[PDB]
Design a protein around this ligand. Structure first.
Ligand SMILES: *[C@@H]1O[C@H](CO)[C@@H](O)[C@H](O)[C@H]1NC(C)=O
Ligand SMILES: *[C@@H]1O[C@H](CO)[C@@H](O)[C@H](O)[C@H]1NC(C)=O
Ligand SMILES: *[C@@H]1O[C@H](CO)[C@@H](O)[C@H](O)[C@H]1NC(C)=O
Ligand SMILES: *[C@@H]1O[C@H](CO)[C@@H](O)[C@H](O)[C@H]1NC(C)=O
Ligand SMILES: *[C@@H]1O[C@H](CO)[C@@H](O)[C@H](O)[C@H]1NC(C)=O
Ligand SMILES: *[C@@H]1O[C@H](CO)[C@@H](O)[C@H](O)[C@H]1NC(C)=O
Lengths: 50, 596, 99
């Protein structure tokens, strides 16, 4: 989507494997604010907004 | 709300809609230059017409915002740059006539072909047919024939065109609240609104005369030495008391004296610093030349070239099937796209040109953070000067030894430094009186000090007085001898070379003081010095956001252009020329004593 | 040139966090009313991106995905993968089965 009309996808009731994203070489920025990437694959959240 | 916020939003809209369009126009010009084909010419013309019409519409929108209600210096600078009418203040018939005159002068200069009367079956164009003859021949009457025949054809075609050109440009300039077209050209150095750092259009001519009065003894000694050597080369034509004949200066117009280095060498028996054979022996490709230049620019601390530079530049001649312009040009296409179009050979000249154009690329990259209409040099002198300082630093024997191109057992004695400094003087010092005389003559023509029937009588009088060069035979008013040069026939400012030459040595002294070099200035190399690169990049990142006086304070610590770094650079050569001119007579006579 | 990506260039006030503005109403920068037409001091707020493959890295298109993690008083159901150690039987081990 365009930045004025940015797409928001609500992610619920599944298993979120963040190590697949973190260990990818295809991403230039993976800057996490408020949490570290190593404990993302352990912690649990109510909803994920993408 | 306020006028300033309205202008800020308008400038954001302008930069946004003028960046993609400038990128399209620049890409079309690039596709024309790397591929000379008729559809690329049509695409270039369409993009240029769209760009000029868009600039006309944005200037029309921009004038409705008055200047005196804006206090921010950068916003006021962009509004001042945008609100210039250009040719739009002139009537549509006269604007069309001026554009037609400029285009037909471009076609006459580009497609001008001249050869000997009674032998018309084939003829030679200026580049490279006449350039090689002017730079390499040793025959007096052949060079006289080529010079007089090319000024006969070109001047007799261009004289009514130039007479219309001066009137139309003066009309446009006085319609734009300037005194003349010379004042319009001098308005590039005009700084208004900054406390202390203000520079006036009338101060430029006074500063040029003040610097040239200190140039004059060094040029007089160099002219006496060149006169003695050309008297040795041509025994009877040159007089001991008079000026130099015009067709013997090694170039078509007298722009550079660098083609007289073979005739005027001090110590021919001693070797040269030519590194061509070493690159041929080590098989140095042009890619290796540009990578060594990039290594030089990362050694001083400047940013390295982008991936798009290496992907999209043409650093080698494409072939017979594909046509390209051979002139080396660095292109800032916009949106972070930086390219070099050069047909690079394995020579020292192409290596120094590669350093010069990559200096242009570094200068273009440095002000990429600036707004679009401020993406230029602070004046026209800085943009060329930052390439010429790289040409100075790369040409040193220390740089050649450091990169391995010169033998470590090469003996650097005083004689090689003298002849290298003389070559640099023939390139650099010799263009200064020609540049000053040409710009002062054009300023007096635009100001109306010289009437149209007296243009040439004054001009040769100026050339004898300033350049010390005499005409072979007298020329009447049917000739147009200035407009045979590329820049004057195609509406280009010429004082940029004078300002570039002085800024070159000012920047050289500033960076060598930054690099803590402890020897002669011409022995100085600015590689390996992070602080010199930082001092350079502080001025380089500003672009046109700050005044050139403040930028010169940022580099050299002075508020004005200075002549002392040039004299300090050539001081060993100045003492050597004063020693060599004991028997001979320094200075010239403006009379017709050699030949007329 | 890929011009299929527009941005908002002007708005009267800054956006709130996680706000989407898809309005296409003419921005009024001046005192004069726009009247719905893009004239002088009145600009269309949505402007297109110019994306060419020969552009520099500061102008090349970048796809950005921002993941927002919030904890609310409801039971958290988007959990990470729970790494499972192979099962060992017939030995005195510390077992952790589903908490
Ligand atoms: C130059 O133009 C010709 C004719 O249009 C074309 O065939 C050729 O591919 C072009 N060269 C490049 C490098 O694109
Ligand atoms: C002038 O405008 C630029 C942006 O247009 C801004 O960054 C700068 O801070 C302004 N300067 C002053 C003194 O307001
Ligand atoms: C441009 O031309 C218009 C029309 O004469 C004039 O009103 C305006 O002042 C000119 N702008 C400048 C900067 O001279
Ligand atoms: C420029 O320098 C950076 C930092 O060292 C490096 O990552 C990059 O690959 C260099 N670019 C080129 C084209 O060598
Ligand atoms: C170089 O130095 C030597 C000895 O100091 C001297 O004899 C010679 O004249 C010098 N050459 C030049 C060109 O100054
Ligand atoms: C500058 O740095 C490069 C890289 O370390 C080195 O090869 C070169 O010799 C240095 N220059 C001098 C004059 O030491």
């Amino acid at each position: 989507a365009s930045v004025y009309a940015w797409n928001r996808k609500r992610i619920s009731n599944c298993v979120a494997d963040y190590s697949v994203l973190y260990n990818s070489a295809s991403f230039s920025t993976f800057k996490c604010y408020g949490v570290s990437p190593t404990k993302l694959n352990d912690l649990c959240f109510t909803n994920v907004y993408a | 709300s306020t006028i300033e916020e309205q202008a800020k939003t308008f400038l954001d809209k302008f930069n946004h809609e003028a960046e993609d369009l400038f990128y399209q126009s620049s890409l079309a010009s690039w596709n024309y230059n790397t591929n000379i084909t008729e559809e690329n010419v049509q695409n270039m013309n369409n993009a240029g017409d769209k760009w000029s019409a868009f600039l006309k519409e944005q200037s029309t929108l921009a004038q409705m915002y008055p200047l005196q209600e804006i206090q921010n210096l950068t916003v006021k600078l962009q509004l001042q740059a945008l609100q210039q009418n250009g040719s739009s203040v002139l009537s549509e018939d006269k604007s069309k006539r001026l554009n037609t005159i400029l285009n037909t002068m471009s076609t006459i200069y580009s497609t001008g072909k001249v050869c000997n009367p009674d032998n018309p079956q084939e003829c030679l164009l200026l580049e490279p047919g006449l350039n090689e003859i002017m730079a390499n021949s040793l025959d007096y009457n052949e060079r006289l024939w080529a010079w007089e025949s090319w000024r006969s054809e070109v001047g007799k075609q261009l004289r009514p065109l130039y007479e219309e050109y001066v009137v139309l440009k003066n009309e446009m300039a006085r319609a734009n609240h300037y005194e003349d077209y010379g004042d319009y050209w001098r308005g590039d150095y005009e700084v208004n609104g900054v406390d202390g750092y203000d520079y006036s259009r009338g101060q430029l001519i006074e500063d040029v005369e003040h610097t040239f009065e200190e140039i004059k003894p060094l040029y007089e000694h160099l002219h006496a030495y060149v006169r003695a050597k050309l008297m040795n080369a041509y025994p009877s034509y040159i007089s001991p008391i008079g000026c130099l004949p015009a067709h013997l200066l090694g170039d078509m117009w007298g722009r550079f004296w660098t083609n007289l280095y073979s005739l005027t060498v001090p110590f021919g028996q001693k070797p040269n610093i030519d590194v061509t054979d070493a690159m041929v022996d080590q098989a140095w490709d042009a890619q290796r030349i540009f990578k060594e230049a990039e290594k030089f620019f990362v050694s001083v601390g400047l940013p390295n070239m982008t991936q798009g530079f290496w992907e999209n530049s043409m650093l080698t001649d494409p072939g017979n099937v594909q046509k390209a312009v051979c002139h080396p040009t660095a292109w800032d296409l916009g949106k972070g796209d930086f390219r070099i179009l050069m047909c690079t050979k394995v020579t020292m000249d192409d290596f120094l040109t590669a350093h010069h154009e990559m200096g242009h690329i570094q200068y273009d990259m440095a002000y990429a953070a600036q707004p679009f209409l401020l993406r230029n040099g602070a004046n026209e002198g800085f943009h060329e000067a930052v390439g010429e300082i790289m040409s100075l630093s790369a040409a040193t024997p220390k740089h050649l030894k450091s990169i391995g191109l010169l033998s470590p057992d090469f003996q650097e004695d005083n004689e090689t430094e003298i002849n290298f400094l003389l070559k640099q003087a023939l390139t650099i010092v010799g263009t200064l009186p020609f540049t000053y005389m040409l710009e002062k003559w054009r300023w007096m023509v635009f100001k109306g000090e010289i009437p149209k029937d007296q243009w040439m009588k004054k001009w040769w009088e100026m050339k004898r007085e300033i350049v010390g060069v005499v005409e072979p035979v007298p020329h009447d008013e049917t000739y147009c001898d200035p407009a045979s040069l590329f820049h004057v026939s195609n509406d280009y400012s010429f004082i940029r070379y004078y300002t570039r030459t002085l800024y070159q040595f000012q920047f050289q002294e500033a960076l060598c003081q930054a690099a803590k070099h402890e020897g002669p200035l011409h022995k100085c190399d600015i590689s390996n010095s992070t602080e010199a690169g930082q001092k350079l990049f502080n001025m380089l990142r500003l672009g046109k956001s700050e005044p050139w006086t403040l930028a010169l304070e940022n580099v050299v610590g002075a508020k004005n252009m200075n002549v002392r770094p040039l004299l300090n650079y050539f001081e060993p050569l100045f003492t050597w020329l004063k020693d060599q001119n004991k028997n001979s007579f320094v200075g010239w006579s403006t009379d017709w004593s050699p030949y007329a | 040139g890929n011009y299929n990506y527009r941005y908002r260039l002007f708005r009267k006030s800054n956006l709130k966090p996680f706000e989407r503005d898809i309005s296409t109403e003419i921005y009024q920068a001046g005192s004069t009313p726009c009247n719905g037409v893009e004239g002088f001091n009145c600009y269309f707020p949505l402007q297109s991106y110019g994306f060419q493959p020969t552009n520099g890295v500061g102008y090349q298109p970048y796809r950005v995905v921002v993941l927002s993690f919030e904890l609310l008083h409801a039971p958290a159901t988007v959990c990470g993968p729970k790494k499972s150690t192979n099962l060992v039987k017939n030995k005195c081990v510390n077992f952790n089965f589903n908490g």
